[model samples]
Target: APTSSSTKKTQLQLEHLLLDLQMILNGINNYKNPKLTRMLTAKFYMPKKATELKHLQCLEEELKPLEEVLNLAQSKNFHLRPRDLISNINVIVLELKGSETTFMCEYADETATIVEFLNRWITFCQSIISTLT
Candidate 1:
């Protein structure tokens, strides 16, 4: 099995990508609008501490490697993420922003996609986690 050396790194990256997204999912899951917005005003601009948006956005931007890994999935050998996967995620963020239906109920499809993304990460992370000796 002459697997490319990068495969392991890619898996780790995918694992992180999943986690990053997962946190975003959870962040939105339990959030009241007050927490995120308050952080935006108070902690967000404070260099002294971590802002809630900082955490979420960090989670959001972590998809960069995911985009690379998923977008290139069709290649025979490469770090690929799903095409437009990042764009779809952007929509999810928008839904989170636009959601007025109150909490999780409004963003059903986005939640579905989030879980799907999490599934991909679990599968990918398994190899990395399970293989650790």
Candidate 2:
């Protein structure tokens, strides 16, 4: 028999998993593949705005350390298989969709901002998803 504390932890984990699954389903139901692709392409093509350049630079600074970790993980004997990677990517997309929906709700009155944010998020999701394939 499980301890009460362990049972509570398991319940919380299960709840989180259910929420994640629901978000993924909602993303699929309201899917817009093209929008996702477009956002990614734009990010690849456009120069960063002056205000955003610092953020981009910060991301660049962090990439090397992150890349090293990713490389090390991939090189591990127990590293995730390609199939697992794809499955994980799908889960990530679902989470992203959930986040996008929440963001939209927050900025609903600002149509242009909402649209821009969603478009960018879609693009990000597309890029990550495509990397798995």
Candidate 3:
């Protein structure tokens, strides 16, 4: 049936979005609370420049792909906004005071927003999965 195919596709996309959101959530959480034990491994190494700068740059690059995915999900009435997450990056840029102390607080403050956003979105995805099932 057409309805069957539509629901199947919906569930598939929803699950994909859930995984993507979870990936971002994991990245943000790790950035906020890195495990020194893991970093001590040979596989893990320090950045050539500031560690925070390299991490922020990677976060910036990775977020855009998630944004593109979320836009498609939004069109399907997912009630999630990619711009909310996207704006947090801009806020971090604006709040940066170009000093070590200020930069520390700015990054921490912005991450709270992003982490909150991802948590809420991941919860919504789970709720949708239940309904779709």
Candidate 4:
């Protein structure tokens, strides 16, 4: 069995990666205009903080011991259902919203509404994760 710390690290890494992917998916989903989509698609070419490079590295490190499990689960033979993937993706979006609220709270000088919104989003993420699992 993995140590508690190891499990926690893995979970955190997954959360971060999910966050990054969620941002990309959100950008794609919320592309209201062609100009916006073009700008975003081009912007992604540059180095960005929201990218999951570091999170992916952390995931790689954490999953070293569980490589076989991950590989087997990801294999075509054991493919994940589209609905399952969609649910997982939705959770990621909830998490991203939570993070955005946090950022807004910090940037906007800790407004009460920002804090309240952040708390609400975090609760939503918690509920989603619990329900999904």
The prediction achieving the highest TM-score against the true structure is: 3
Q: In model 2, which runs have C-alpha deviations exceeding 4 angstroms?
A: 1-4, 31-86, 89-133
Summarize candidate 1's per-residue lDDT along 1-133 as a digit string, tens digits: 2236765664554444465445433333332334333222211111122222122222244355334333323333322233344345444445445333332211122222223444333343444455554
The residue-by-residue lDDT of candidate 4 on 28-128, one tens digit each, is 23323344322321211111122321221122222233233333234342343332332354355455443322231111332221123222323434444
| Model 3 alpha-carbon drift over 4 Å, by segment | 1-4, 32-112
- The full ranking of all candidates by TM-score, starting with the best, is 3, 1, 4, 2
Rate residue 52 of model 1 by lDDT: 20
- RMSD (CA, Å), each prediction: 16.7, 17.1, 16.4, 16.6
In angstroms, give how far residue 129 of model 3 lies from its true place. 2.6
Candidate 3, run of 10 with poorest lDDT: 39-48
Residues 1-133, candidate 3, lDDT per residue (tens digit)?
2335584555454455555555445444343334434322222121222323223333344355445444333433445434444345434434442234332212322222333445444554465456644
* Reference-based TM-score of each model: 0.23, 0.21, 0.33, 0.22
Task: Quantify all predictions' global Cα lDDT against the true fold.
Answer: 0.36, 0.33, 0.40, 0.33
Model 4: number of backbone collisions: 0
Clash list (residue pairs), candidate 1:
69-79, 69-80, 69-81, 70-80, 70-81, 70-82, 71-81, 71-82, 72-80
Residues 5-49, candidate 2, lDDT per residue (tens digit)? 574554453344345334432332343335443223212212122
Off by over 4 Å in 4: 1-4, 33-128
